[PDB]
């Protein structure tokens, strides 16, 4: 007999599938800083991982594996092939190659081989045009609008929460604000919901993000958007910051917490939207994705820039040839 | 008054001293996997990044400060200076570059790195990655001045762990559940202590005494071989390695910041053990915790394990009377 | 030689000091939740339990020290005796019993607890449980001595997470999501602050005017009115309330031991607003971290909200000015 | 238009069957520290209570809701009626019910057994079954007579409490935590459970290979006293607190994790034994086990000694005594 079978009696070989399974598609930085934020907050029994460059996806696995015995998830696996991918609950999409022409290219084969494995999972859309991608995973993938979600205004308003913190001396997750709409440089920072302990700053400071404000908080959404490009500048890419914004949104979805989060859900109905546009407003995650979302009441300025917004997203997407 | 002012009304100005402060240093892929590690398990109230590339190190210190609203560590701070590093708890070393001549340029940049890091935090504990960290730990103990239960080297710890991930693979059962040790010199030359590899307190080698001989059908002995072949096969596949490194040191990082006192395959100084007389370190199961290593196992080994660990012991001590300090 | 020493070969007898001990003071219900709660937060690496019944503090102790295989606390003490207290960071009171020969009973106690705890750490932040909060907080203030950051109460910090629990249950929202502030004094007289209550910074008073009046014919009142009554019906259920307050003291603790800096409402001497000019403690929202309350979020209350707190101001006053020191 | 409403635009009402729910049936000291370290260590999705006493059931679920802010499972519910245990992944049963006969108290929880049983198996027909009630070993064996489901879905917490206790005693005299302290306590739970003197290590050193007396009568420094203070200890708790739930909690716990993680880790929990060490009974007794998504896979063959051996099979004989007896 072997040592395992003499070390180990075995009961049954009962042929067994994940019960909490989750997918990286795209193992760049953004990729890996995602697997390993979900690996490290233990949200997943099995992760899979999908490149087209085999060599480094292969490397990328192994390493994961390597660190097995820090980790409370038992399956790590990787392939070219989506049949690793099989059953899962959330697929994450990092891979990406105008700009938006390759990526829409790049989804075209990517979302069907992911439908044909997950036909039932939650799709999380992180590939940049973030908004337009998100629109474009719909398109293909047929899913209800409650199952495709885009990572959207996620990070904008981490780091905006994060700078409002230092500016107040403040904890981030004790610094309420919520920045909207376009993900990036059209971004909208909503002055009237931003608060400590349910009291206004704006109520407290009618200046606040407006020009005539002698402290100049509008800097700090200015900060958010010159953030991204320094940190680009500085080290060629973002990845820890988005793997942990990332990994935020998968532990609502993987435990149905029915927090609520700025992410780009299908817009069309509000702020004078009748497009089919995906922009990013709070919405309440859990096991079914996006089941409700939050409707905010915002000032002609911040309506008229999240309808701008749709306007230039659907220009771009009726274009599109799938 | 400001719309701090107005929102917030201060009690004390009085900002003490940080109290779980951890340092790293070099943010390659391995310093800034050790800080992501280090971050999401809350092991520190405040996190000190050094490196001499100041682009690099300013944009890894705000990807992470990005993240703040996700962590519970409210301080990440950086800088060419070492007087960000001031009263760390931990400081790791993962900063580095003929052999003899790469070994004495790590000795350089140790010469340079390990008086800073005294400088500002001299009752810290050292806990050195960079390669060859048996080596490079006698330098980091060397430099320092530091008694030896607080100069760690992360040693057989990753070996260890690849063990028994591969362990686990061959039986189907997670590598929390198998047991087993890879000591001595961390790489090529380690030690798989067949003895000491079981299941629930059941020795395979009892089960089955061929194992880790040649004369095995199983060849278990491949599972130590794949230790090492995996190490270069990651290398081969994405340039480098940093996720298990990370994991493995974070692990390390717990135990010494939580004084929890479990017992780790880590480089410490073995003078005394195993016909060892000279000033080398390798790696044997140690006691981790508040002030570094307390303690250690002292593991029988077989006349042959014993000859290998000696063997390690005087190529290190040969490379290491020719370094110059 | 004994097993030990042949297993294991001691590098320094170094006798060490706890670097993030806790302490309990009253092992009843209260305090037996705070313990386990704050032992699978990972918050102390000591854990302190005192009480005067010795036996169920030992059985107490014991049955924690049998679960240590799976935790990371690796010391747990308990004693009659305040020595085991020594070098706490915090000190957590739930020790306690005509309501006013009530409250004198406590201060009874409290005058055998505080100076004790003071006497073993005299650096530590106190944080009050026990009832009635608000007049023990400013009794553990007056008999320490310590400054008003260092001596918190639990205060309205349990009454605002069930306000939230509620606000998410009729939202179909997590409580996480629900914001919602429930201040001044704790219990029957707190105050539901309806202007701050938002999701994702949507005002619910500015979208639904009647908001927490009479004439609201949804009736948000209510909402608060369930706060007060689900503590006397769980009391009604099962003699107790245990699981809540234990959680709650354990979010506090993480702040505090982790100096995060994060907002809470909790018991802090309001003397200077609202026009309350008596030493009395009551709820606002409060910056917690390594320093205790460094600082405090100044609400904007309407003129009806701040009359309930200037009346709560007046009779708290009204029962500290004839107690007996 | 309500104020939900006017907030809150929904995209779809459904509601999913329960992904990852546990259900914990007994809310006394034990069943209620179960629920509290499941709640904390963010295993259920769901949380489902049940009991006879429904005041209580009540009061331990409201209180528990209250604290809802803190904690990541968003369902807690409850009740006297078992459709609130419904698509249950594991069930944990707790319940159990002055000197009367060894037979009587246990025919006093195989009466309680036949009504629980039958309403969790009705349920959650696919579910695994987690017994902590006392005499483990033998409601286990009650369990699986009554529930009909193959064996690996049947699970004792038999000996992981006692092993967890000997390894943090061991600790305490070695100055090791006791997670790199090694060591299994097998066979039937409680009193008449084995210390297994070979597997007694620390850093894969055997203690016995050390100190050949180990766990026997002449050993100077009586080892044998660490797992007579296991014992001891359980009895001690009992005396000073009147009950015991902290450590019973974590353990089970502990548990959960590999069956809800699917982990596939080895615990020293009660099995259906017959086949090994010359027991021939329908019995359980404790052994590393192999825990995961399909309760019990897998088992390890402890190579015991004759003494280990017969110890084993005494409690296999004392156990099936009882059970032939038992009337279902
Ligand atoms: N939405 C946000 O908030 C946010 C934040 C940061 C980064 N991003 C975005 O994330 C994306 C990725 O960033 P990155 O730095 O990791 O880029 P990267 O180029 O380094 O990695 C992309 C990976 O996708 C892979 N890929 C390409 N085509 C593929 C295909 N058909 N199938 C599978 N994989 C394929 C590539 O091989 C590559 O490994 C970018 O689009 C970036 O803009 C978004
Ligand atoms: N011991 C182990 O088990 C183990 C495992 C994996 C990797 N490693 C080792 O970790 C080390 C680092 O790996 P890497 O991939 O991150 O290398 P890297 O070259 O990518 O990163 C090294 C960093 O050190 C910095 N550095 C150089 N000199 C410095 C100085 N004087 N002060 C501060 N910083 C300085 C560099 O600028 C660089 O950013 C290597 O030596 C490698 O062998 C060890
Ligand atoms: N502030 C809040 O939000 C909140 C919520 C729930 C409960 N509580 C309060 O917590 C307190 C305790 O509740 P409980 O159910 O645990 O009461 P309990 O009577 O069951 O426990 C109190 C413990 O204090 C001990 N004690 C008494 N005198 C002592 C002394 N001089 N030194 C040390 N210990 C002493 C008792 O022996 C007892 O074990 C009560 O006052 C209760 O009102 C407060
Ligand atoms: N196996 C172990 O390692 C271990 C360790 C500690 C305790 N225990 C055991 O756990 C059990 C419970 O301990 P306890 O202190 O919580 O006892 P308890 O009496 O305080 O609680 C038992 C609960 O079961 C309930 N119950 C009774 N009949 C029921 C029924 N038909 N349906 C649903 N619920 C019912 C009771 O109402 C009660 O609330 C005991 O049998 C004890 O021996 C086992
Ligand atoms: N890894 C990688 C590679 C290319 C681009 C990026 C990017 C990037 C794009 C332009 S500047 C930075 C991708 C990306 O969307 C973000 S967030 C962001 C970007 C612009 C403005 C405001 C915000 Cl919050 C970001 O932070 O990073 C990341
Ligand atoms: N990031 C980076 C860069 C260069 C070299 C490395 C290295 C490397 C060296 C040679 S092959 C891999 C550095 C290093 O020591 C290890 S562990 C290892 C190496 C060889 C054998 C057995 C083991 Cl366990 C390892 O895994 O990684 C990492
Ligand atoms: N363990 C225990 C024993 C006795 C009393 C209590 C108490 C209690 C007191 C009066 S009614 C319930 C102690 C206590 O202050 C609370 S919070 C609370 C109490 C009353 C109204 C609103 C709130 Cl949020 C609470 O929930 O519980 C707990
Ligand atoms: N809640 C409660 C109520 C009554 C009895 C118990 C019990 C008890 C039984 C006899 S002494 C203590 C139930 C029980 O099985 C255990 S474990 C145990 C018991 C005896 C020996 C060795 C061990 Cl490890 C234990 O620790 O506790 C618990």
């Given at each position: 007999?072997?040592?395992?079978?003499?070390?180990?009696?075995?009961?049954?070989?009962?042929?067994?599938?994940?019960?909490?399974?989750?997918?990286?598609?795209?193992?760049?930085?953004?990729?890996?800083?995602?697997?390993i934020?979900?690996?490290?907050?233990?949200?997943?029994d099995?992760?899979?991982?999908?490149?087209?460059?085999?060599?480094?996806?292969?490397?990328?696995?192994?390493?994961?594996?390597?660190?097995?015995?820090?980790?409370?998830?038992?399956?790590?696996?990787?392939?070219?092939?989506?049949?690793?991918?099989?059953?899962?609950?959330?697929?994450?999409?990092?891979?990406?190659?105008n700009?938006?022409?390759?990526?829409?290219?790049?989804?075209?084969?990517?979302?069907?081989?992911?439908?044909?494995y997950?036909?039932?999972?939650?799709?999380?859309?992180?590939?940049?045009?973030?908004?337009?991608?998100?629109?474009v995973?719909?398109?293909?993938?047929?899913?209800?609008?409650?199952?495709?979600?885009?990572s959207?205004?996620?990070?904008?308003?981490?780091?905006?929460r994060?700078?409002?913190?230092?500016?107040?001396?403040?904890?981030p997750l004790?610094?309420?604000?919520?920045?909207?709409?376009?993900?990036?440089?059209?971004?909208?920072?909503?002055?009237?919901?931003?608060?400590?302990?349910?009291?206004?700053?704006?109520?407290?400071?009618?200046?606040?993000?407006?020009?005539?404000?002698?402290?100049?908080?509008?800097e700090?959404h200015?900060?958010?958007?010159?953030?991204?490009?320094?940190?680009?500048?500085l080290?060629?890419?973002?990845?820890?910051?988005?793997?942990?914004?990332?990994?935020?949104?998968?532990?609502?979805?993987?435990?149905?917490?029915?927090?609520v989060?700025p992410?780009?859900?299908?817009?069309?109905?509000?702020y004078?939207?009748?497009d089919?546009?995906?922009?990013?407003?709070?919405?309440?995650?859990?096991?079914?994705?996006?089941?409700?979302?939050?409707?905010?009441?915002?000032?002609?300025?911040?309506?008229?820039?999240?309808?701008?917004?749709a306007?230039?997203?659907?220009?771009?997407?009726?274009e599109?040839?799938?």
């Amino acid at each position: 007999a072997t040592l395992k079978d003499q070390l180990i009696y075995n009961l049954l070989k009962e042929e067994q599938t994940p019960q909490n399974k989750i997918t990286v598609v795209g193992v760049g930085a953004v990729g890996m800083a995602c697997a390993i934020s979900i690996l490290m907050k233990d949200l997943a029994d099995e992760l899979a991982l999908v490149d087209v460059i085999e060599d480094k996806l292969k490397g990328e696995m192994m390493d994961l594996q390597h660190g097995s015995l820090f980790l409370r998830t038992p399956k790590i696996v990787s392939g070219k092939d989506y049949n690793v991918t099989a059953n899962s609950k959330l697929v994450i999409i990092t891979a990406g190659a105008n700009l938006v022409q390759r990526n829409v290219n790049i989804f075209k084969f990517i979302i069907p081989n992911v439908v044909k494995y997950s036909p039932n999972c939650k799709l999380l859309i992180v590939s940049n045009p973030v908004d337009i991608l998100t629109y474009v995973a719909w398109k293909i993938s047929g899913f209800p609008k409650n199952r495709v979600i885009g990572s959207g205004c996620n990070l904008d308003s981490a780091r905006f929460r994060y700078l409002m913190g230092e500016r107040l001396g403040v904890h981030p997750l004790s610094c309420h604000g919520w920045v909207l709409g376009e993900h990036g440089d059209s971004s909208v920072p909503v002055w009237s919901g931003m608060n400590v302990a349910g009291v206004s700053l704006k109520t407290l400071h009618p200046d606040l993000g407006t020009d005539k404000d002698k402290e100049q908080w509008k800097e700090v959404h200015k900060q958010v958007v010159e953030s991204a490009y320094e940190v680009i500048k500085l080290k060629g890419y973002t990845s820890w910051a988005i793997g942990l914004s990332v990994a935020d949104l998968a532990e609502s979805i993987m435990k149905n917490l029915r927090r609520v989060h700025p992410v780009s859900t299908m817009i069309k109905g509000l702020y004078g939207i009748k497009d089919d546009v995906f922009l990013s407003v709070p919405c309440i995650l859990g096991q079914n994705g996006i089941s409700d979302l939050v409707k905010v009441t915002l000032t002609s300025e911040e309506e008229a820039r999240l309808k701008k917004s749709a306007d230039t997203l659907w220009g771009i997407q009726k274009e599109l040839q799938f």
